């Protein structure tokens with residue numbers, strides 16, 4: 042793993058300064074202190090380096106969210122939603138270059154597309170299960186289908202977080218995004234007709 | 235415009251069957267009934283053909299939304315939001331291949347990026363002005379900053395509509411998306427603490 046780790050670290054650091062396209066395999070071996078052929082032993086391509094970096098970021102989010110799901114943080118419903126959204130805000134916000142490049146890679150790469158899609162389905166299914174419980178306990182009204190509600194709320198968070206982290210025009214300022222998303226989640230989940 | 239129109243139509247029809255990358259300039263001249271050099275007279279590249287197609291779609295949405303904004307459709311607030319969102323649902327839903335390719339082009343093209351960004355700012359500013367009026371008339375509570383609320387709601391619609399039109403996993407079924415978005419808009423806009 043040692044040289045592997047070094048290639049990974051080098052790729053994340055270089056991705057802070059430029060896109061994958063403008064980083065070469067020699068760039069990565071160089072930064073990792075190895076030759077170009079030795080690189081090809083650890084990874085088949087620079088594309089595969091990103092995949093692995095993205096894979097680690099996405100699992101770290103997912104594991105963090107599972108940790109919460111095993112610990113009912115003794116609190117109000119607004120705060121429960123906030124705490125879970127914040128897992129994503131912090132995890133991806135700590136790995137902006139990889140998030141940024143991983144999103145872009147979805148266009149060009151079926152493995153990146155499928156990884157992102159697999160995790161989104163999981164996070165949506167968990168969101169829906171929580172909405173259902175809130176409904177069964179009688180705290181949330183039976184409005185939209187829980188899964189379709191979960192789907193749009195997760196897609197909002199996806200787009201809105203990434204816009205904010207990349208500083209897009211338009212975007213919600215990074216210091217306002219969490220409140221903005223929590224409001225919309227809580228009002229749409231608990232709000233009646 | 236006649237030959238121009240033909241190149242445009244040819245590009246939209248071909249984009250129904252494959253991505254821009256897999257369509258050549260000869261493909262477009264051919265379908266438009268002209269030679270390759272004659273193509274280059276009307277457009278500098280196939281990329282510029284998409285830009286123009288996207289430009290027309292985006293303006294058609296925008297004009298449709300301005301038309302609504304000049305005609306207060308005599309109705310309830312839920313229906314007002316629905317009618318405006320539906321402008322986008324129908325316009326872009328009628329031009330899926332161009333929407334789909336135009337989104338993808340944002341990565342590679344600063345002009346596509348800026349066109350999309352300019353229109354999003356306009357639609358967000360209009361959304362915010364309507365939220366403000368609803369607040370001033372006393373129908374909507376003064377919760378989040380109206381513009382940051384508008385920003386996330388528009389980004390949700392962007393992502394969620396496109397996912398649905400491209401049939402992504404995950405996505406809201408196209409026949410459920412409009413209700414799904416209207417619920418979240420109305421509950422977040424009118425919902426209190």
Ligand SMILES: O=C(NC[C@H](O)c1ccc([N+](=O)[O-])cc1)c1ccc2c(c1)OCO2
Pocket residue numbers: 121122123124125126129130133164165167168171195198199200202203
């Ligand atoms: O917030 C996201 N997921 C939220 C997640 O589904 C979730 C949040 C909160 C709870 N919860 O507290 O019970 C349960 C699940 C989200 C999902 C995808 C993202 C992203 C964020 O940022 C970039 O890509």
Ligand SMILES: O=C(NC[C@H](O)c1ccc([N+](=O)[O-])cc1)c1ccc2c(c1)OCO2
Pocket residue numbers: 314315316317318319322323326357358360361364388391392393395396
């Ligand atoms: O719905 C979108 N915009 C909604 C628009 O901002 C708006 C909707 C409704 C009102 N309204 O009724 O007063 C005012 C404005 C939206 C914005 C961007 C999109 C998109 C949809 O689909 C793909 O890209």
